Amino acid sequence: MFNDRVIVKKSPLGGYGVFARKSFEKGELVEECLCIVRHNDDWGTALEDYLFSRKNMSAMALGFGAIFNHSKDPNARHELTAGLKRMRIFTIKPIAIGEEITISY
């Protein structure tokens, strides 16, 4: 699974992760994806570690959105629209090819 800027591979952090296929400057858009949004009570345990929540709603990011791993020292950030319908991942520091792209906890 990949495109012109990122590729998904096995990550040392466990499971799968998103890696840069090209260089990224700070603040550059890495991924923009749509999310499926539903009341918190509609979600089972299946996607607990991937869902993003706000109030009584949770959203599952499609595209590459849910694949980005978390980290105590991330090089990217996620951003969600008001209704949690769209997610964007931006770099918060330069990123070189082969480096894993991670977001905060």
> Is 50 annotated among the ligand-binding residues?
yes
CA distance 60 to 91: 21
**Which of the residues 23 through 52 are near its own copies (CB under 8 A)?**
32-34, 36, 38, 41-47, 50
| Stretch (H or E) spanning 70 | strand 69-70
**20 Cβ contact partners less than 8 Å away, ≥ 6 residues apart:** 5, 6, 95, 96, 97, 98, 99, 100, 101
Q: Closest approach of Cβ 44 to Cl ion, in Å? A: 4
CA nearest 70: which of 46, 28, 101, 102? 102
Site membership for Cl ion, residue 14 (CB under 5 A): no
Comparison of 4 and 41: residue with beta carbon closer to Cl ion: 41
Q: Which residues contact Cl ion (rule: CB under 5 A)? A: 43-44, 46
Q: Which residues are annotated as a binding site?
A: 16, 50, 70
Binding site for its own copies (CB under 8 A): 1, 3-4, 8, 16, 32-34, 36, 38, 41-47, 50, 58, 60, 62-67, 86
